[PDB]
């Protein structure tokens, strides 16, 4: 029927003076644009069809052509920035926003989807969608007593589009738009659908990827406990964004980090730091590194939860990127920790894996490790035990690696190496 039309037949139907012929041709275009492989988006654009589709969005009297054109334009907008731009340049934004209030749920949903692609292109189209007034009607679609009465796919599409209104930086979304969206986001974060939860967590992770004021906007809404709970979820698509959001939050102030600790987050890190998914391990170790950069009482919470042995484990064996994050966590720990906490660190076995990582080619991890060693030696000086630590390093082959690093081409590297040798190995 409307299957496998040529673009020229589509054009001929759309240019007819017959609304029903236009509808059939538009459905044919929709079917071309929704096929598995290589939708002919550029051919459709070049045929000049976008303004026709946009005009069809306004035909309240023929809801089927509204739907077909909305779907066609959705899929054009799903392509490259230039293809999305063609949709925007056709005037689609206000027309889709007008369709959000449609009495036909499938049409409103299609408009939600299209606005999600447009806003998802980037900060500029995101903010232009916002300026056209999309947030109010989008949120009105979610103003129901119980989200469970909404169709599952409908709610997932709304959540994803809102997450695109929260996404991207340079600039980040307008502060007032974030404040407007956040309560609905908090509500979606307690919904029981795994995809809604995943995308709500992604939105929160975007909103916390910024300066402390943005983090504070999120933390003030009281979502950290729910984020920790979701951090313990079994579905990896939920754990990943929840953990990203938590890590972002602990890049903030020590009080914000403390809200992560108070919510129980550390109790999850034995599993996270041994998680079989490499990216979970990496992100959890980065999170830890930004917790050990905090206050001594927070370092002490890391100690109490038994997480130093897990950091020793990741330093001993993990993907190299995770090992680099672990080195960072250790240097932060040693820079901020009390003497007793650093002693504890040594008693957990940090020295040998720390030394074994000095044979790595990455310059920055070498610097990080040498810093950590210096800090530990400083604690040993305060205890008068530099000799015992020197013996430790010598027995595991670390002295050979440092003395070798004296010949390292990097400046700060061979400087710190020389200082360690002449100061503690003479």
């Amino acid at each position: 029927g409307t299957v496998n039309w040529s673009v020229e037949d589509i054009v001929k139907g759309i240019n007819s003076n017959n609304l029903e012929s236009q509808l059939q041709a538009t459905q044919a275009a929709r079917k071309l644009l929704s096929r598995e492989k290589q939708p002919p988006i550029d051919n459709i654009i070049r045929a000049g069809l976008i303004p026709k589709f946009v005009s069809f969005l306004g035909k309240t009297d023929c809801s089927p052509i509204q739907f077909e054109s909305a779907w066609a334009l959705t899929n054009i907008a799903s392509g490259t920035s230039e293809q999305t731009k063609a949709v925007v340049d056709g005037g689609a934004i206000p027309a889709f926003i007008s369709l959000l209030a449609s009495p036909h749920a499938h049409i409103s949903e299609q408009a939600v989807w299209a606005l999600g692609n447009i806003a998802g292109d980037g900060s500029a189209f995101r903010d232009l969608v916002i300026k056209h007034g999309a947030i109010d009607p989008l949120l009105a679609l979610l103003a129901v007593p119980d989200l469970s009465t909404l169709a599952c796919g409908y709610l997932r599409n709304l959540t994803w589009t809102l997450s695109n209104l929260c996404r991207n930086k340079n600039p980040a979304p307008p502060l007032d738009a974030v404040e407007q969206i956040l309560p609905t986001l908090v509500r979606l974060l307690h919904h029981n659908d795994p995809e809604v939860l995943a995308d709500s967590c992604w939105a929160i992770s975007y909103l916390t990827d910024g300066p402390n004021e943005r983090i504070e906007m999120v933390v003030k809404k009281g979502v950290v406990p729910q984020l920790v709970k979701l951090l313990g979820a079994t579905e990896l698509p939920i754990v990943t964004p929840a953990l990203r959001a938590i890590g972002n939050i602990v890049t903030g102030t020590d009080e914000q980090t403390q809200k992560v600790i108070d919510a129980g987050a550390l109790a999850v890190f034995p599993s996270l730091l041994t998680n079989p998914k490499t990216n979970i391990q990496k992100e959890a170790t980065w999170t830890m590194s930004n917790i050990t950069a905090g206050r001594q009482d927070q370092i002490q919470q890391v100690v109490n939860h038994g997480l130093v042995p897990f950091l020793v484990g990741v330093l001993s064996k993990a993907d190299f990127k995770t090992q680099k994050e672990a080195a960072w966590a250790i240097t932060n720990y040693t820079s901020g920790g009390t003497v007793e906490q650093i002693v504890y660190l040594v008693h957990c076995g940090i020295i040998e894996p720390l030394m074994n990582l000095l044979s790595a080619k990455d310059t920055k991890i070498i610097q990080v490790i040498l810093d950590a060693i210096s800090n530990i030696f400083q604690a040993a000086e305060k205890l008068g035990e530099t000799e015992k630590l020197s013996i430790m390093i010598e027995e595991c082959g670390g002295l050979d690696k440092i003395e070798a690093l004296q010949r390292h081409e990097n400046e700060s590297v061979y400087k710190a190496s020389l200082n360690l040798i002449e100061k503690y190995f003479s």
Partner: peptide
């Protein structure tokens, strides 16, 4: 992951 989705 990509921000856009095509309806298939």
């Amino acid at each position: 992951f990509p921000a856009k989705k095509r309806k298939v």
